Amino acid sequence: QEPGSGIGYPYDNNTLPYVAPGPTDSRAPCPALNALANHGYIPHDGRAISRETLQNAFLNHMGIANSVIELALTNAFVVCEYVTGSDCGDSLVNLTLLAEPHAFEHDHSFSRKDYKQGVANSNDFIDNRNFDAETFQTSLDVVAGKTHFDYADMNEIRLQRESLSNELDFPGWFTESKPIQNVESGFIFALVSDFNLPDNDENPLVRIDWWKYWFTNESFPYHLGWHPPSPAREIEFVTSASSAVLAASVTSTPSSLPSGAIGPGAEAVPLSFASTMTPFLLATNAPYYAQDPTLGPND
Ligand code: HEM
Ligand SMILES: *[C@@H]1O[C@H](CO)[C@@H](O[C@@H]2O[C@H](CO)[C@@H](O[C@@H]3O[C@H](CO)[C@@H](O)[C@H](O)[C@@H]3O)[C@H](O)[C@H]2NC(C)=O)[C@H](O)[C@H]1NC(C)=O
Numbered sequence: 001q002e003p004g005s006g007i008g009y010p011y012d013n014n015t016l017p018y019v020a021p022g023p024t025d026s027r028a029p030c031p032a033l034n035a036l037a038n039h040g041y042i043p044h045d046g047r048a049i050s051r052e053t054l055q056n057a058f059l060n061h062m063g064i065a066n067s068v069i070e071l072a073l074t075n076a077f078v079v080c081e082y083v084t085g086s087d088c089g090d091s092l093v094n095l096t097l098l099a100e101p102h103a104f105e106h107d108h109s110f111s112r113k114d115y116k117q118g119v120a121n122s123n124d125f126i127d128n129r130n131f132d133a134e135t136f137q138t139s140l141d142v143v144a145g146k147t148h149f150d151y152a153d154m155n156e157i158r159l160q161r162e163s164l165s166n167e168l169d170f171p172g173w174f175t176e177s178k179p180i181q182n183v184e185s186g187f188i189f190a191l192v193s194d195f196n197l198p199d200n201d202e203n204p205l206v207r208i209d210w211w212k213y214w215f216t217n218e219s220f221p222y223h224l225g226w227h228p229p230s231p232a233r234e235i236e237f238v239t240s241a242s243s244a245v246l247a248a249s250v251t252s253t254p255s256s257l258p259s260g261a262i263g264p265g266a267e268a269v270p271l272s273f274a275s276t277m278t279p280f281l282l283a284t285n286a287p288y289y290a291q292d293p294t295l296g297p298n299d
């Protein structure tokens, strides 16, 4: 928000306003990076981004400590080298390359379509990067009529997304990605669980309106009482939440789940790509921004 507005105070004492991305700006498949870039906490054009810029942006503006993004930084740079064909040093070329499929970006996302979702021909691909309202609605519908949800609910959401994706994706495309997805499940708990409840740290419940605002608007739900977690969330919280989601008993089982969907997931690890492997072409769509309504500088 506008620095003088004091909307972030006393959690964030140095805010910057929301500015919609323009057609030439680079955006990510990540709702967090996109929100940061929309505020200029990382470059508004989404290009030439250092590790420290990301670290400071997450820590100072979203209450996410360095430990939370350690692997994510490593993997961002692995993907940058893979896509561009050379080492990216400490300047991530852009955000858009992070939507390279079957890499850091993955199938069965909560709010994005898959790279080959619903395509008639094997060579076709679609926008697996920008926010997709319909896809996100398939996630929200699992918790329809509710204001909050718990670990077991999140487990049901990711299962619904896996089932839909396995059914809709071009045959042979679908590839399950429980370890990366469920770090992101833990990220959702870390950012938008309800810290106003007494047992938040031990038993976090996602506030659905906060989650919807963040994902749909790619800006921060201050108007709904949200603020950056204080103290900043650490990696322990995230991976514990990840484990808890996958540990939670399944009471409704969708059909067409891939093998071993239900049960513990592997620890997320650094990505690696063979030098002989050429990257898949990136979707070229202009960056998404909220238009129903469009957002003001304080939104
Ligand atoms: C340098 C740090 C980060 C990088 C490079 C990064 C990268 C990515 C990428 C490539 C995806 C796409 C995966 C897919 O859904 O197919 C993604 C998704 C996601 N990211 Fe980030 N991320 C970072 C930090 C964070 C943080 C700190 C949060 C919140 C605390 C966050 C929240 C999410 C969520 C919730 C998704 C899933 C979106 C969906 O499934 O629709 N990210 N991220
Ligand atoms: C973010 O950065 C990525 C990585 O550099 C950009 O994707 C790449 O964009 C270039 C164009 O600048 C594409 O190069 C073209 O490739 C075709 C076919 O290989 C060739 O005939 C053209 O002469 C040109 O070299 C490249 O394919 C593409 N990489 C991938 C894997 O899709 C991306 O455009 C950047 N996005 C933004 C919004 O900045």
Ligand SMILES: *[C@@H]1O[C@H](CO)[C@@H](O[C@@H]2O[C@H](CO)[C@@H](O)[C@H](O)[C@H]2NC(C)=O)[C@H](O)[C@H]1NC(C)=O
Pocket: 209, 212, 213, 214, 216, 217, 223, 290, 293, 295, 296, 299
């Ligand atoms: C995206 O942000 C906009 C702007 O903050 C939200 O619009 C507001 O919605 C609330 C209800 O929750 C109203 O009190 C305000 O009057 C709205 N303002 C405008 C301009 O409409 C919008 O709800 C957010 N989107 C989501 C899905 O959370």
Ligand SMILES: *[C@H]1O[C@H](CO)[C@@H](O)[C@H](O)[C@@H]1O[C@H]1O[C@H](CO)[C@@H](O)[C@H](O)[C@@H]1O
Pocket: 283, 284, 285, 286
């Ligand atoms: C992205 O741009 C490419 C050309 O630069 C197209 O060939 C791709 O099909 C893809 O097109 C989509 O996104 C662009 C934004 O650059 C739109 O202009 C198109 O209408 C399309 O949605």
Ligand SMILES: *[C@@H]1O[C@H](CO)[C@@H](O)[C@H](O)[C@H]1NC(C)=O
Pocket: 009, 010, 011, 012, 013
């Ligand atoms: C914001 O400023 C107030 C008043 O000086 C201070 O008490 C608070 O610690 C600051 N918040 C942060 C995150 O530094």
Ligand SMILES: *[C@H]1O[C@H](CO)[C@@H](O)[C@H](O)[C@@H]1O
Pocket: 178, 179, 180, 181, 182, 183, 186, 238, 239, 240, 242, 243, 246, 264, 265, 266, 267, 268
């Ligand atoms: C989240 O983190 C837990 C613990 O590392 C994993 O089991 C899960 O698969 C996801 O990566």
Ligand SMILES: *[C@H]1O[C@H](CO)[C@@H](O)[C@H](O)[C@@H]1O
Pocket: 235, 236, 237, 238, 239, 240, 243, 267, 268
């Ligand atoms: C989540 O999982 C990691 C291992 O993946 C632990 O290091 C952490 O303490 C938390 O349980």
Ligand SMILES: *[C@H]1O[C@H](CO)[C@@H](O)[C@H](O)[C@@H]1O
Pocket: 201, 202, 203, 204, 236, 237, 240, 241, 244
């Ligand atoms: C790891 O940490 C999470 C979040 O604090 C808990 O919910 C979980 O039970 C485990 O202790």
Ligand SMILES: *[C@H]1O[C@H](CO)[C@@H](O)[C@H](O)[C@@H]1O
Pocket: 239, 240, 241, 243, 244, 247
């Ligand atoms: C990972 O961690 C979670 C939360 O502590 C457990 O519920 C799960 O069984 C696994 O050990």
Ligand SMILES: *[C@H]1O[C@H](CO)[C@@H](O)[C@H](O)[C@@H]1O
Pocket: 248, 249, 250, 251
């Ligand atoms: C975990 O527990 C639930 C009940 O909470 C069962 O429905 C499920 O089959 C699993 O054993």
Ligand SMILES: *[C@H]1O[C@H](CO)[C@@H](O)[C@H](O)[C@@H]1O
Pocket: 142, 152, 153, 156, 250, 251, 252
């Ligand atoms: C078991 O409980 C889950 C949520 O924990 C529901 O989504 C499901 O329909 C069943 O009642």
Ligand SMILES: *[C@H]1O[C@H](CO)[C@@H](O)[C@H](O)[C@@H]1O
Pocket: 249, 250, 251, 252, 253, 254, 262
């Ligand atoms: C739905 O069905 C699966 C397997 O049939 C169970 O693992 C799950 O607990 C739920 O009952």
Ligand SMILES: *[C@H]1O[C@H](CO)[C@@H](O)[C@H](O)[C@@H]1O
Pocket: 142, 156, 157, 159, 160, 251, 252, 253, 254, 255
């Ligand atoms: C229980 O919930 C699952 C996952 O959301 C559905 O696939 C199933 O139809 C039932 O409603």
Ligand SMILES: *[C@H]1O[C@H](CO)[C@@H](O)[C@H](O)[C@@H]1O
Pocket: 293, 294, 295, 296
């Ligand atoms: C987004 O842009 C629209 C213009 O259509 C305004 O009406 C709105 O206030 C917001 O700034």
Ligand SMILES: [Br-]
Pocket: 026, 047, 093, 094
């Ligand atoms: Br670029």
Ligand SMILES: [Br-]
Pocket: 117, 118, 168
């Ligand atoms: Br489809």
Ligand SMILES: [Br-]
Pocket: 178, 179, 264, 265, 266
């Ligand atoms: Br796994």
Ligand SMILES: [Mn+2]
Pocket: 029, 105, 106, 107, 108, 109, 112, 113, 114, 128
């Ligand atoms: Mn995806």
